DNA sequence: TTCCTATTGCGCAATCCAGTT
DNA sequence: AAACTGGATTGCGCAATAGGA
């Protein structure tokens, strides 16, 4: 059954390559969402800043 | 020389360990961040909402 | 148990990158 | 400039071992 070794390896080195490739991609995606969230975020910081300037104007 | 080689190996194996851990790292860091981000952004929309009604109402 | 794949840590070699001689 | 260092990164296979029919 050492006659299985190799065949099994390759069967493995391919499963590896796959897993990894997957991972890397899942990061990218995750990585990406960070930028999407940082977009929303500043959007809000500025927005809030705005409303604030507003009541600060209005009231005081 | 030989050990010449085996030591340059030793060296690299470590740079490799280090560098791989720093990446395991960054990869988490990001996870964490994608969280504080989701939370932050979210408590920020609720602040805009809150801050707004305070305006509709402080107007007429 | 029994097979397969999936995932992980690890080492080799080739590069890549800077700061050097 | 042009080869030269020496760590950092990265593609790649190996082996152990987690998982889930």
Swiss-Prot record, chains A, B:
Result after altering residue 10 to A: No effect on repression of E2F1:TFDP1-mediated transcription, no effect on cell cycle inhibition or adipogenesis
Post-translational modification: Sumoylated, sumoylation blocks the inhibitory effect on cell proliferation by disrupting the interaction with SMARCA2. Phosphorylation of the GSK3 consensus sites selectively decreases transactivation activity on IRE-controlled promoters.
Chain residue ranges for the region called Basic motif: 6-33
bZIP domain residues: 2-60
Lineage top rank: taxon: Eukaryota
Effect listed in the UniProt record for changing residue 14 to A: Increases interaction with TFDP1 and TFDP2, reduces transactivation activity and represses E2F1:TFDP1-mediated transcription, loss of cell cycle inhibition and adipogenesis induction, no effect on DNA-binding
Effect of residue 5 to A: Increases interaction with TFDP1 and TFDP2, reduces DNA-binding, transactivation activity and represses E2F1:TFDP1-mediated transcription, loss of cell cycle inhibition and adipogenesis induction
Oligomeric form and interacting partners: Binds DNA as a homodimer and as a heterodimer. Can form stable heterodimers with CEBPB, CEBPD, CEBPE and CEBPG. Can form stable homodimers (also isoform 2 and isoform 3 dimers) and heterodimers with CEBPB (with isoform 2 and isoform 3) and CEBPG. Interacts with PRDM16. Interacts with UBN1. Interacts with ZNF638; this interaction increases transcriptional activation. Interacts with the complex TFDP2:E2F1; the interaction prevents CEBPA binding to target gene promoters and represses its transcriptional activity. Interacts with RB1.
Stated family: Belongs to the bZIP family. C/EBP subfamily.
Protein name (database record): CCAAT/enhancer-binding protein alpha
Gene: Cebpa
First-to-last residue of the parent protein present: 281 to 340 of 358
């Amino acid at each position: 059954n050492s006659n299985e070794y190799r065949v099994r390896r390759e069967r493995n080195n391919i499963a590896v390559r796959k897993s990894r490739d997957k991972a890397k991609q899942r990061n990218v995606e995750t990585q990406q969402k960070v930028l999407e969230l940082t977009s929303d975020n500043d959007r809000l910081r500025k927005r809030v800043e705005q409303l604030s300037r507003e009541l600060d104007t209005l009231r005081g």
